Structures are given as C-alpha cells and as structure tokens.
Ligand binder design. Structure first.
Ligand code: HEA
Ligand code: HEA
Ligand SMILES: CCCCCCCCCCCCCCCCCC(=O)OC[C@H](COP(=O)(O)OCCN)OC(=O)CCCCCCCCCCCCCCCCC
Ligand SMILES: CCCCCCCCCCCCCCCCCC(=O)OC[C@H](COP(=O)(O)OCCN)OC(=O)CCCCCCCCCCCCCCCCC
Ligand SMILES: CCCCCCCCCCCCCCCCCC(=O)OC[C@H](COP(=O)(O)OCCN)OC(=O)CCCCCCCCCCCCCCCCC
Ligand SMILES: CCCCCCCCCCCCCCCCCC(=O)OC[C@H](COP(=O)(O)OCCN)OC(=O)CCCCCCCCCCCCCCCCC
Ligand SMILES: CCCCCCCCCCCCO[C@H]1O[C@H](CO)[C@@H](O[C@H]2O[C@H](CO)[C@@H](O)[C@H](O)[C@H]2O)[C@H](O)[C@H]1O
Ligand SMILES: [Ca+2]
Ligand SMILES: [Cu+]
Ligand SMILES: [Cu+]
Ligand SMILES: [Cu+]
Ligand SMILES: [Mg+2]
Lengths: 264, 40, 547, 254
C-alpha cells in the first residue's frame, strides 16, 4: 500500500527454517555415519535440504516471472553471487596454501631446519600432459560452449545456439567429472596417510564437487531455455551460471599449473 | 510505479566495486609473487 | 501474523535482528554460567567441584553434585571436564554469542534503517542465516553431551581446535563441534553477503557512502572481514575432519603433516575473527558518544578509514598467535612489526571518541556510561596488546593468564559493553518501553566494578607465570585467583540483574511517547520513525532533507 | 637447593631472573610498562576531566568542531614514535633470544602426554620427569598424605606440590645450554620462567632455545599448551649446580 521504491519485499517463507532443521540433521547424521551407525539419518537430512533448496530456487524464478526482479533487484542479485564467488575463492585458497606449503617446505626428519623431498619420496605423480591436459581441453572447450550460449541470448536473441551451446557445455562438464573419476581410480598413491594424497584428493576433490554443482546449475538454466525463460535484458540466473562456470575454469587452470605442471 | 526507480547512484557504485575488487585482487597476487620472489 | 509465521518464517529484518539479540543473550547466559563454574573451581587451589567421583552418578545426578564442593581427599581431579568447560565457554562466545548479538542482532535491525532501506537485499536468505545459526548452536550444545575425550562427554580441545590433540581426541563430540562451527560460518557468510549488498545497493537517494552513518560503516567492514575470513576457517576445520574421520595426515607428522600449518590457516581466520567481534561495537560507541555528548562525531572520514585500515591490516598480522610455536626469526620479526602498525589506527579511534566528548554537553545517561566504560577497558586492554606484540616479551607471557586478561579487557568486555550500550540506547526504539534509568546505571556500575576485579588480578597471575587451561595451580597464586573469582561472581549477578531489568522493561516498562526519546543529537534515520517502527519501514523512500 | 624459579603467594611482578635473556625480558617489560602506564593514565584523566568540564550542567551548549588537521597528525606521529622507540629496543632482545649460539650442554627435550623426556646426546643420558604427584608416582595428580611425604623425599616442601617433579634436568652455571624441543604425542610446551625461555613441543619439528644459567638453585616451569586431561600435571624442574658438582652427576646417571 503506497510505495515508490523498486526493492523486492518478500512474503514470509518456511524454507529458511525448514532447511536448517534438515541441515542440522544431515550433519548430525553424517557424524554418526562416520562413526559406524546407519547413513539413514544423514540422508534424510540431505533429502530435506535438497528438497528445500529446490523449493527456494523455484520461487526465485516464480518471482522473476512475477515481475519482482526490477533493475535494482537484478543488480543486487548480481553482487550477491559475486560476493559468494569471492568467498568461494577464499575457501579454495586454504587448500592452495596447504599444498604450496607442503610443496615448497615439505616435512623432513629435521623439519624446520632442513626440509625434505618434494614430491614425497616414492610418490609417483600424474603425467601433466597425458590425461590432465585432456581435462584441461574438456573444460576450456565447455567454457567456450557456455560463453557462446551467453553471447547468443544477450547479443543475438538466438534461442537455438543458447540451448545448443548449453547442452554441449553440460555434456563436457559431466564428461570432466567422468574422466576425472578415472584419474582417481588410476591414482598412483593413496588418500590416507600421506600429505600429497591429502593435498591432491582434497583440492581436486572439492573442485570436482564444484564442477558437479556448476553442471547441475547450467542444466537448470538449459531446462529454463527449454521453457523459454530468459530475455536479453533479464537473465540473472543465466548470468551467474556462466560466472560460476568461468570461476570453476580459473580454479582448474590454477590447479593444473599448480599441482600438475609446477608440482609434478 | 515499479520499474521506474533511478539507479544512477547504484550503477556507479557497482562499476566502482568491480573496478575496486579487480584492482585489489591483482595487488594480492603481486604481493604473493613478491613474497615468493623474496623469501621462498 | 501468528507466533510461528512471525518468528519461524520472518523476512522482516527487524524481527530477525530481534531473534539474534535474544538468542545471543540465551547462549551468553549458558556460556556465562560456564564461567561462573570455572571461577568457582579456580576460587582456591585443589579440585573440589570437578571430581572424577561425580562421574559414577548419572548425567542429571552427577551434574547437581558437581555444583557443590568436596574435600581434596574425596576429589580425584577430572581435568577433562575443566577442558570441556573452557572449550565450551570459548566456542559458544566466539561463534554463538557476541558476533550474533552485534552483527546478527543490532546489525540486521538498524543498518537498513540507517541507510534508509525498506528491507535487506536478500531478506529470505537473511532468515536462513539465523536458523543456520540455531542449527550450529544445537550441534555445539550436542558436542557437550556426546561421546568425547578420555571416555567422557564433551570435547576439551580449546576454542581453536589445535591438532594433533583435536584430531586424536576420541569420540565424535569434536566432529559435532566441527560441523557446529561450519554452520556458524555458513550463517555469517550469508549474513555478510546480505549486508554488503544491502549497504552498497539499497542506500537512500542522495546518501553517498561518505554520508552513511558510522554504525552502518562498522557493520559494512565487519561483513567484508566475515566474507573473506570464515571461508578460510572452513578449510582449516575440514582438514581436521578428514584427519579425524578419513585418516588423512594434514597435521599428523608420521604421514608428513605439520600441526603448525593448521595454526597459520586457523589464525588467518582467527584475528579477523576478533576484529569481527569489536568492529560493530566501534560503531555503536560512535553513535552513543555523539548522541550524549550532543556533538557531531569527531573526524568522520578518518574514523571510517581507520576501520578500513584495521580491516585490511587485520589479515596480515595473524602469526603473532604463534610466536612460541617455532617460527623463523624473519617471520616473527615481520609479524611483530605488522602487529605494531595495526595498533596505530586502533589507537587513533580512542582519541576521536575523547575529542567528540571535548566541547560537547554530556548527558551521562546509561548508554553514555557503557560507551565511556568501553573507552577505558579498550585502552586497558589495548595497551597490554602492545606488550604482547613484542615477540621478546611474548615468550614469558604467552599461554599465561596475562593473555586471558588482555583479550577479556579488549574483546570480551569491549564487545559486551558494546552490546549493553546498544541495548539501553535502542531498547525503547525496539520495544516501545523504556528501561528504568536507576537500574541501568546500577547494572553498569556493578559490571564495571566486578569485571575489573575479575580480569585485572589475572594480569598478575600471568606475570607470576600461571599458564592457560590449568584446572589447578600452585598454592602460590591463590590470592589473586580468589580476587578474580569474587569479581566474576559479582559480575554474574550484574548480568542476572540485567535479565531482570529487561524483563521488567519488556512488560512493566514505561511506554515511550515520541519517535526520538533521547535528544536532538540522536540524529540518524531510526529516530525519525515511530518508537516501535512500522512493520514495513521506508515504504516511501526518505528524501535527502531527512538526514 | 635454593628454590628460585617459583611463584610467591600473591606476587604481582615477574619470577626471579636467572639468565641474561630473562634480565632483558624483565627490562623490556619495565620500559613498556612506563609507556603503557602513562597512556592509560593520560586517557583516563582526559576522559574524567572531559566528563566533568563538559557536563551539560557545567557547560550548556555543545561545540561545533569536527576536525583538527594539526592535532590529528600529533595523534599519529606520537604513537608511531612511541612504537619505533619500543621497537628499537625489542628487536635486539628478540634476535638475541632466537639466534642460537655454541652449546656447552646440548639437551633434547621431548613432550609426552603428561610427562617429559630429556636426552643428553653427548653424555649418553636419558630419563623422564614425572610430577611428584603423578599416577606414575602413585598419586592421583592431587595432594594426599602419601604425596606430601614424597615431596619431602626429593628435598621439596608441601609448598612446591604442582611444580616439583620426580626427576630434574640438571645444568652447570655460566654454561650455554641449548635445549632442543620436539613433541611426541600432541603439542606440549617447555618453559622455565626464571630462564625466560618458552618453546612449543610440536610433533615433527626440531625447535631450539638457549639459556645461560647465571645463578644456582632449583627453577620450575609448567607445560604451556593444552595437551589433554593432565595438561596441568606435567611440570619442569631444572636444578643448576657448579661445574664441579655437575661433573660428578654426569658420571653418576650413566
Ligand atoms: C577485540 C579484539 C581485539 C583487539 C582490539 C585487540 C587490540 C591489540 N591486541 Fe590482541 N587479542 C584478541 C582480540 C583483540 N586484540 C584475542 C581474542 C586474543 C586471544 C585468542 C587466544 O589466544 O585464545 C588476543 C591475544 C593477542 C596476542 C598474543 C598473546 C599470545 O597468545 O601470546 C598479541 C601479540 O601480538 C596481541 C597484540 C594486540 C595489539 C598490539 C593491539 C593494539 O592494536 C591495540 C591498540 C592500542 C590500544 C587499543 C590502547 C589505546 C592506544 C591509544 C589510544 C594510542 C595508541 C598507542 C600506541 C600505538 C603506543 N593480541
Ligand atoms: C568474547 C566472548 C567472551 C565473553 C563474553 C567472555 C565473558 C567471561 N570469560 Fe572469557 N574466554 C573467551 C571469549 C569470552 N569470555 C575465549 C574465546 C576463551 C578461550 C578458551 C580457551 O582458553 O581455550 C576464554 C578463556 C576464559 C577463562 C580461563 C580458561 C582457562 O584458561 O583455563 C576464564 C577464567 O578466568 C574466562 C573468565 C570469563 C568471565 C568471568 C566472564 C563473564 O562471565 C564476566 C563478565 C561479563 C558478562 C557478565 C557479560 C555477559 C554478557 C554477554 C555475553 C552478552 C550476552 C548477550 C546479550 C545480552 C544479547 N574466559
Ligand atoms: C581468482 C581465483 C583464484 C583461485 C583461488 C586460489 C587463490 C589462492 C592462491 C594463493 C594461495 C596462497 C599460497 C601461499 C602458500 C605459501 C607457502 C607457505 O605456506 O609459507 C610457509 C610459511 C611457514 O613455513 P615454514 O615451515 O616456517 O618455513 C621454514 C623454512 N624451511 O607460512 C607462511 O609464512 C605463510 C605465507 C603467507 C601466505 C598467505 C596466504 C593467504 C591466503 C590468501 C590468498 C587469497 C588469494 C586472493 C587473490 C584474489 C582472488 C580474486
Ligand atoms: C548425481 C547427479 C544427480 C543430480 C541430482 C539433482 C538434484 C536436483 C537439484 C536441483 C538444484 C536446482 C538448482 C537451481 C539453482 C538456480 C536458481 C536460478 O537460476 O534462479 C534464480 C535467479 C533467476 O532469475 P533470472 O535469471 O533473472 O530470471 C530470468 C527472467 N527475469 O537467478 C539468481 O538470482 C541466482 C541465484 C542462485 C544462487 C545459486 C548459488 C550457487
Ligand atoms: C591461471 C593460470 C595460472 C598462471 C600462473 C600465473 C600466476 C602466478 C601466481 C603465483 C602465486 C603463487 C603463490 C606462492 C606464494 C609463496 C609465498 C612465499 O613464498 O612466502 C613464504 C615465506 C616463507 O617463510 P620463511 O620461513 O621466513 O622463509 C625462509 C626460507 N627462505 O613466508 C615469509 O616470507 C615470512 C613473512 C610472512 C609475510 C606474510 C605476508 C602476508 C601474506 C600476503 C597478504 C595476503 C593476504 C590477503 C589479503 C586480503 C585482504 C585485503
Ligand atoms: C579486506 C576487506 C575489508 C575492507 C572493506 C572496506 C572497503 C571500504 C571501501 C570504501 C571505498 C570508499 O569509501 O570510496 C568511495 C567510492 C567512491 O564513490 P562515492 O560516490 O564517493 O560513494 C558511493 C555513492 N554511491 O565508492 C565507490 O563508488 C566504490 C566503492 C565500492 C566499495 C565496495 C568494497 C569493495 C572493496 C573490497 C575488495 C575485496 C578484496 C578481496 C579480494 C580477494 C577476493 C577473493
Ligand atoms: C562432498 C565433498 C567432496 C570433496 C572431497 C573429495 C573427496 C575425494 C575422495 C578421493 C578418494 C581416494 O581414493 C583412493 O583410495 C585408495 C586408497 O587410498 C587409493 O590407492 C589405491 O591405488 C594405489 C596404487 O598405487 C595404492 O596406493 C593403494 O594400495 C590402492 O588402494 C586410490 O588410488 C585412491 O583413488
Ligand atoms: Ca580449585
Ligand atoms: Cu591476532
Ligand atoms: Cu603437555
Ligand atoms: Cu600441556
Ligand atoms: Mg601456544
């Protein structure tokens, strides 16, 4: 009743409360799963959360189709995602720190005085050109496929290449994690009991979790192109997809030139 | 009158925020490249 | 419009902020109760309350037995409980009490008002930050009643979860605490993202950032620290989680780990963390001193840029928590000097507040007392920091109650005074009922007397060599430990009295007439709105002439 | 036999010096303590006076000023000088206590959950220092009739309960002991307040301190990093004796 501002005001919503009940149970049940009892309490949580996330984000489309995403709101949603991406970079930095330390000054039997050998004695690394470069061409190509999709909708309004490009990107994205899940099978070293395995499998591990996320995210954007949901002016969800995906590429390119090239 | 609102102050602030964060990010990458070229 | 839809589904920031305030009080009281029991044992040497014998009774039983002493002959010292209490105290306070009441509680309420915003940028995600915070607090409480170390309940690691002790302490209680901290970060990061966007995108027309109220700036800087620090802590504790439960060797040396690398990564979060606590108090104190000294806050910009300066430098001084851990002399040198740089802008702000009082007409009402009290404690606390900054002297002082005294003066009492200053200042403006000025001024004075006789005696114990996390000490300390445990007991009564004062105020309280109930110089946008402000504030955006 | 490194029942200053580094830590703290004692007194009086001189009763109308470009630079240059002052005397004391010299004695100290371990690599000696109230020395990590008699045994009082250990690291006066420290279980920390040395025992790191013992007597120190249930109950005793007496011990312990 009687307002002059464009800012999005929201009706009350269960999902904040419902997600945090599920998330508490997810993480409590995971603790118990990690200590011998049944995964069931954990996966109840995962389902309640994944159900809540779904509900949540379905309304952020409903509202955008409802004409709530005004100029400012859309702009604000762009910062929100960038600030998020920045804190994603800060998360990964803790793992590049952990790697670069145990690479520059690896632990030797006379540790702070005289450092040890890197890569650890008897750790056979991956050939940085055989397979990892296949995955670096898988991702760099998928990053082009998703950018042609952006440039299509934004600067051509060409809905065919938007859909086509995204399908190719989602394909190569899921292909990366498939090809990477082979590099894990064919790993010349263990996960437990050595730092190299600890630094390697956790750093590429989280990146792979971020690729899985970025591919699911791109698929939600394609599913929406199937329903013809974006316009050249209004496409914040599609915008953040290509940002997030390009962020994943930067992370891999670092990993490649850190763990594989420089750290072989 | 939704859609009408004047954004000039905010769109300016966003260009600064982008210009700022990009600048800040290279300084830090440079600072670590210095620190590595100094005391690695 | 029902108790559930209003508080379990709110998207109105004013309510979510109120939720934060009240939960912060609740978890506070829990954690303050931990400290009254802690000083109870430390009252005089020998263990009397934390006896292994009490374990043979059940949970409820052995509890109420522990609340009442014993003879040194009938008491086997259970150090584990002691460690879980000190850990319980710290973790609750640093992750679930003080930041939530300042950043979550006041920050969510007033920062949108100060900048003339109708809501927050992402007010549905806002609610998620609160309920994730409750989820963390649950997991945190669960950690106290869980398969823990040395065959008992609870994790007795210390609020910073140092390894290999953390990684190898038995049970799963620690893993809960890990995930509790995970969610407390997830809360904060979302809250921060909201605050940053809100501040940058939703200001009033004509309000440039150099026209933004100081509290809003203080919250804005706090949000940036949170945005960048907490994700680093996530990695830190995830590495503890995989060492504990997936047998990696991030910090296990037999596999090639370095327990020192944890401290780097943790304290890379750990200092920003301590500036995330006090920075909102800087703002609140700025607003209060300017109001009740009837004088525009001395040196606006500088003040801000000081906050920016502190905020930037806060990341690159982290290793002065590690002077003893075995750091290269080159390193120890750098962190000694950088730590000294921070001291300058953190000092300067103390002067600006005095300069605001200089010249003005000072109404010594309750909020002004608390802000004045803060000034004292923040100096007393800050100067002992200069001592510790010099690595040479740190060797003697490190891991002694001298540090405990330092960080209580500057951080605990600093932020607590910040919180109370906020509460009395804004209670009418949030409830519609004012507090009784006699009770407030009493609560302040009890706290100020008690809390000084609590932690200043601890300075001595540190110089006398009493180390941290000791359930028992040589008899040759007990003089000061009794002085402290007295003050701490008195302090507990003050916080109890306060809980009454607000109970009186929220029910039997003097309903507030006007929009502004303080004086003309409480001149920011919240005092333009109704005393309990409308459920939808700034439907009509305020025109430039409104500030 | 003169118990020196020790708390006094309600003391406020440091523990007695016993080394050149512990003299300089006593000195630096005093120098700083003047400067901090000034700054708090100066801030307290500025606060008190302003509250009196500028109370709404004692002064009716507030002032209008907000900035003072001269005085504000005064507010900055002074603490930078104050810190350059303290810094100039503190960086020397830091290098001195961290640059290790030639060792007269070398000792390796190892942190074990709730006891210590000393090695003299040269003189071929090894032993473990448990607290006199230990469960390895019968006690429940508490005082009891039995536990007091044992304190007398080693030449200690009921006073020294939580400080006195069943075996001591013994050292020659005016000889530079280089103490190397590592942890075995979790992180422990070796300190002797009288000697002015603290070094964390981190598993998997060879960390080093040094102290030149100037006086003779018994010195104490307790563990300074939370290490588990009995973190209070693993202290340090360093008996320092004359070179003649120490040469007699170095054959005995063999
Ligand atoms: C509220 C947060 C806060 C603030 C503001 C501070 C203000 C400072 N504090 Fe610290 N402190 C912590 C939260 C804070 N700190 C916490 C939580 C811990 C412990 C965690 C744990 O160990 O468990 C800690 C422990 C700590 C240590 C390590 C002790 C140890 O464990 O060995 C050191 C040493 O470098 C230190 C230095 C400082 C310095 C140099 C300043 C200075 O920047 C202060 C500025 C000076 C003042 C505020 C006094 C007023 C001065 C003026 C008005 C003019 C300025 C004068 C000069 C520059 C000479 N702090
Ligand atoms: C900033 C948060 C905070 C707060 C508020 C405090 C309030 C107090 N703490 Fe501090 N404490 C720490 C952060 C705090 N503490 C940390 C992080 C550690 C490290 C754990 C470790 O060593 O590993 C520590 C360790 C510590 C120890 C020693 C443990 C050991 O070394 O073995 C002791 C005992 O002397 C201590 C005494 C007190 C007392 C008596 C109070 C108070 O009870 C006294 C007076 C103050 C009040 C009564 C204010 C209470 C009010 C609030 C908290 C506001 C609540 C919210 C609202 C009203 C909205 N604390
Ligand atoms: C845009 C997306 C990009 C992808 C995201 C990844 C970005 C992160 C990349 C940089 C990561 C930092 C890596 C730093 C590792 C340095 C190695 C190290 O740990 O130093 C070791 C030192 C202690 O070693 P010590 O044992 O004492 O040495 C004894 C001598 N033998 O310990 C030290 O002294 C610490 C050295 C200082 C290191 C500080 C690290 C801070 C981490 C913040 C990085 C954030 C990057 C932000 C960039 C902007 C991005 C937009
Ligand atoms: C093992 C494999 C099996 C797979 C299992 C799959 C389980 C199902 C899980 C489904 C998860 C769904 C994820 C959906 C997230 C996408 C949300 C979204 O894009 O919409 C939000 C909003 C859209 O607004 P807009 O683009 O402007 O609309 C255009 C018309 N104006 O755009 C935004 O504002 C962006 C906000 C999104 C933040 C995302 C954070 C990352
Ligand atoms: C995508 C395509 C890829 C293409 C690649 C091209 C991009 C290149 C990027 C390279 C960056 C890699 C980062 C590696 C940095 C290594 C850091 C380092 O070497 O410093 C460690 C050093 C070691 O310590 P020390 O024991 O004293 O050494 C003695 C032995 N000589 O530590 C010291 O010197 C001790 C002094 C400590 C100083 C700490 C300084 C603070 C850290 C910097 C600030 C960062 C914090 C972020 C700030 C955010 C807030 C604004
Ligand atoms: C470390 C983090 C802690 C530091 C946070 C404090 C930053 C405060 C910056 C304040 C800048 C400023 O005050 O200048 C004003 C500038 C000029 O614009 P003006 O017209 O005066 O005001 C806006 C009116 N709409 O205002 C502008 O128009 C642009 C201001 C944008 C400020 C947003 C803050 C961005 C800076 C954060 C950089 C993050 C670096 C992290 C990099 C690592 C990423 C992983
Ligand atoms: C949800 C969040 C996701 C982020 C976390 C990422 C988790 C990534 C998990 C990686 C799983 C590691 O799996 C790992 O198991 C085995 C034992 O350690 C390894 O080792 C195996 O091959 C090696 C052959 O030389 C041998 O050393 C081992 O005897 C053999 O068991 C595998 O080669 C490796 O792939
Ligand atoms: Ca006791
Ligand atoms: Cu710090
Ligand atoms: Cu120990
Ligand atoms: Cu210990
Ligand atoms: Mg320590």
């Amino acid at each position: 009743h009687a307002k002059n501002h464009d800012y999005h005001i929201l009706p009350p919503s269960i999902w904040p409360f419902m997600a945090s009940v599920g998330a508490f149970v997810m993480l409590f049940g995971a603790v118990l799963w990690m200590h011998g009892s049944g995964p069931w309490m954990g996966l109840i949580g995962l389902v309640v959360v994944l159900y809540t996330m779904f509900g949540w984000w379905s309304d952020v489309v409903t509202e955008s189709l409802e004409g709530d995403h005004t100029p400012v709101v859309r702009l604000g949603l762009r910062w929100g995602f960038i600030l998020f991406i920045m804190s994603e970079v800060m998360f990964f930095s803790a793992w590049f720190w952990s790697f670069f330390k145990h690479a520059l000054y690896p632990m030797g039997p006379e540790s702070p005085i005289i450092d040890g050998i890197f890569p650890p004695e008897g750790i056979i690394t991956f050939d940085p050109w055989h397979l990892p470069l296949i995955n670096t061409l898988i991702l760099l190509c998928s990053g082009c496929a998703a950018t042609w999709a952006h440039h299509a909708l934004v600067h051509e309004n060409n809905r065919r290449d938007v859909a086509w490009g995204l399908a190719l990107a989602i394909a190569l994205g899921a292909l990366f994690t498939v090809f990477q899940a082979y590099e894990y099978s064919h790993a010349a070293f263990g996960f437990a009991g050595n730092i190299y395995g600890a630094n390697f499998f956790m750093a590429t591990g989280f990146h792979g979790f971020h690729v899985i996320v970025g591919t699911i995210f791109l698929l939600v954007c394609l599913i929406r192109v199937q329903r013809g949901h974006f316009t050249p002016e209004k496409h914040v969800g599609f915008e953040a997809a290509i940002w997030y995906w390009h962020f994943v590429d930067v992370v891999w390119l670092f990993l490649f030139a850190s763990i594989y090239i420089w750290g072989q | 009158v939704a859609g009408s609102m004047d954004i000039t102050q905010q769109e300016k602030t966003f260009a600064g925020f982008v210009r700022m964060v990009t600048w800040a990010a290279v300084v830090i990458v440079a600072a670590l490249i210095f620190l590595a070229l100094a005391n690695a | 419009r029902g108790f559930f839809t209003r508080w379990f589904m709110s998207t109105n920031h004013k309510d979510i902020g109120v939720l934060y305030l009240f939960t912060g009080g609740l978890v506070g009281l829990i954690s303050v109760a931990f400290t009254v029991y802690m000083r109870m044992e430390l009252m005089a040497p020998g263990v009397q309350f934390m006896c292994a014998e009490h374990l043979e009774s059940g949970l409820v039983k052995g509890f109420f037995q522990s609340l009442w002493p014993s003879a040194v002959e009938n008491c086997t010292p259970n150090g584990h409980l002691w460690n879980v209490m000190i850990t319980g105290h710290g973790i609750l306070m640093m992750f679930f009490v003080v930041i939530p009441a300042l950043f979550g509680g006041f920050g969510n309420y007033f920062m949108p008002l100060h900048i003339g915003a109708p809501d927050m940028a992402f007010p549905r995600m806002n609610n998620l930050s609160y309920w994730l915070y409750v989820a963390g607090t649950s997991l945190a409480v669960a950690s106290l009643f869980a398969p823990g170390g040395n065959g008992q309940l609870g994790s007795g690691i210390g609020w910073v979860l140092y390894p290999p002790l953390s990684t190898s302490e038995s049970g799963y209680s620690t893993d809960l605490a890990i995930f509790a901290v995970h969610l407390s970060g997830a809360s904060s990061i979302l809250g921060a993202i909201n605050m940053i966007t809100t501040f940058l995108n939703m200001r009033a027309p004509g309000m440039t950032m150099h026209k933004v109220p100081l509290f809003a700036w203080s919250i804005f800087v706090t949000a940036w620290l949170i945005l960048l620090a907490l994700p680093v802590l996530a990695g830190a504790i995830t590495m503890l989680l995989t060492d504990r439960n997936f047998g990696t060797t991030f910090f296990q040396p037999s596999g090639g780990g370095d327990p020192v690398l944890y401290q780097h990564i943790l304290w890379f979060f750990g200092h920003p963390e301590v500036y995330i606590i006090v920075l909102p108090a800087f703002g609140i104190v700025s607003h209060v001193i300017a109001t009740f000294a009837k004088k525009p806050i001395f040196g606006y910009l500088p003040m801000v840029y000081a906050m920016v300066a502190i905020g930037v430098l806060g990341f690159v001084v982290w290793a002065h928590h590690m002077y003893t851990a075995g750091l290269s002399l080159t390193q120890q040198s750098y962190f000694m000097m950088a730590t000294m740089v921070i001291a300058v802008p953190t000092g300067i702000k103390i002067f600006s507040w005095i300069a605001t009082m200089w010249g003005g007409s000072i109404e010594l009402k309750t909020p002004m007392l608390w802000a004045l009290g803060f000034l004292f404690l923040f100096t007393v606390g800050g100067v002992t920091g200069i001592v510790l900054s010099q690595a040479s002297v740190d060797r003697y002082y490190h891991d002694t109650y001298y540090v405990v005294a330092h960080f209580h003066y500057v951080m605990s009492l600093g932020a607590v005074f910040g919180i109370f200053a906020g509460i009395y200042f804004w209670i009418g403006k949030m409830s519609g009922r004012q507090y009784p000025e006699w009770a407030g001024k009493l609560h302040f004075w009890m706290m100020f007397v008690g809390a000084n006789l609590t932690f200043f005696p601890q300075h001595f114990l540190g110089r006398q060599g009493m180390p941290r996390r000791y359930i028992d000490y040589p008899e040759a300390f007990a003089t000061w430990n009794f002085v402290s445990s007295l003050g701490a007991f008195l302090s507990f009564a003050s916080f109890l009295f306060f809980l009454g004062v607000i109970f009186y105020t929220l029910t039997r309280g003097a309903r507030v007439t006007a929009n502004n109930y303080w004086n003309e110089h409480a001149d920011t946008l919240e005092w333009t709105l109704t005393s309990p402000p409308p459920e939808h504030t700034f439907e009509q955006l305020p025109k430039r002439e409104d500030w | 036999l003169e118990i020196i490194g020790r708390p006094q029942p309600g003391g406020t200053g440091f523990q007695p010096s016993a080394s050149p580094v512990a003299t300089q830590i006593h000195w630096l703290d005093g120098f700083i303590l003047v400067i901090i004692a000034a700054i708090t007194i100066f801030v307290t009086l500025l606060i008190l006076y302003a509250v009196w001189r500028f109370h709404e009763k004692r002064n009716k109308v507030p002032a209008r000023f907000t900035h003072n470009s001269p005085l504000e630079i005064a507010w900055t240059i002074v603490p930078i000088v104050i810190l350059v002052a303290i810094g100039a005397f503190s960086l020397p004391v830091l290098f001195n206590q961290q640059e290790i010299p030639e060792a007269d004695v070398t000792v390796k100290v190892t942190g074990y959950q709730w006891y210590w371990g000393y090695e003299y690599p040269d003189e071929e000696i090894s032993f473990e220092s448990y607290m006199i109230g230990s469960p390895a020395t019968g006690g429940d990590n508490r005082m009891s009739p039995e536990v007091e008699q044992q304190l007398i045994e080693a030449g200690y009082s009921r006073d020294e309960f939580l400080l006195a250990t069943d075996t001591a690291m013994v050292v020659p006066v005016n000889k530079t002991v280089v103490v190397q420290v590592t942890g075995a279980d979790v992180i422990h920390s070796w300190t002797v307040p009288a000697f002015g040395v603290k070094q964390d025992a981190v598993p998997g790191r060879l960390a080093q301190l040094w102290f030149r013992a100037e006086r003779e007597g018994i010195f104490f120190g307790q563990c300074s990093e939370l290490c588990g249930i009995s973190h209070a109950y693993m202290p340090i005793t360093v008996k320092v004796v004359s070179e003649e007496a120490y040469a007699a011990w170095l054959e005995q312990h063999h």
